[PDB]
Design a protein around this ligand. Sequence first.
Ligand SMILES: [Zn+2]
Ligand SMILES: [Zn+2]
Lengths: 189, 194
Amino acid sequence: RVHEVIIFNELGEICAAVHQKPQVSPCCNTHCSLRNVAKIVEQIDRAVYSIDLAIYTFTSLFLADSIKRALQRGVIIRIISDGEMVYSKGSQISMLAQLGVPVRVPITTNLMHNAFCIIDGFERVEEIRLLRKLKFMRPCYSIVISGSVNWTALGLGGNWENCIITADDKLTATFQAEFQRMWRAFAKT
Amino acid sequence: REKASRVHEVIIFNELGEICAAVHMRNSSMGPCCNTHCSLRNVAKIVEQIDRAVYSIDLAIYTFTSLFLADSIKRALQRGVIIRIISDGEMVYSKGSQISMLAQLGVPVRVPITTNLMHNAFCIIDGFERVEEIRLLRKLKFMRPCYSIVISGSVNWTALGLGGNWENCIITADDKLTATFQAEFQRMWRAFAK
Ligand SMILES: [Zn+2]
Ligand SMILES: [Zn+2]
């Protein structure tokens, strides 16, 4: 399965001249930011039951659109955000909250820098199944995308960022558990 | 089996990190805690990896404020470990930043030229490529036993929970991940400025 480090750096745009968005034409730049973006979005496009998103700042249009498409397929999406940033200027979260996506934020003022996203997490999918009242689910498996606090900027700004995309059962288990924990303990908006 | 026994977990700092502070103080006065989110246990797991380093620690870091972390980097240095820092061009000067102190002890520090954000927060311990480079550079025919460990996560996992913010880092000896992080360190280090 997938187990990969996505790395944004200063070389991400050196191939700009050769360039359901994004549609990335082939290039020879191993550091292509567009390729990085397309890989992340792909994982979202592959969600079938659930997306749990703990995020610090959500300004990316490419990401918001993929979250939008997921909803239309009937993927159950929940967002956890930093309290200060949640409805700051540029935030896509309001838009998503308009479509029915629930959003929770911490009570405490501290920085919520845990930017990760669990797709079809095992514990979460089983949770849906029971509440959805089912026995058989369509086939899927857990993916976590996690890393630097602005990986969800999706290359926006040309910074040095990173996220790991992995199907590792232990890591995906831990992230999903913490989201469940934060979801129960945080406040709605 | 013994390799699969090696460190591979995610460490999470959250608001429950200091819930056990009184339990700890009662024990210290002479009278181990049950908190799964214990922030002290978190930092001990992190610092355990630093103390393990045999040859190299390559640190790509956004902000380095922790005294407790700078201390462990000091022990490694006195153990002979070769430490290198890549930092954010602006945060290197900020309040509480330990970069100057470490640099004065002879740690080489590099920053990017631009004012863009260096939001990488990773640490490679004895990355295979870097140990080989060190072996080749000192004309050695062998090295002591060791293995790659990388710590990587949210922008300020290096504050070590100080501040009680939500932070996280993967700590793993996973071969692919360590090699990938070490390679980006080598690239940046070559590309960057003193
Ligand atoms: Zn390209
Ligand atoms: Zn404790």
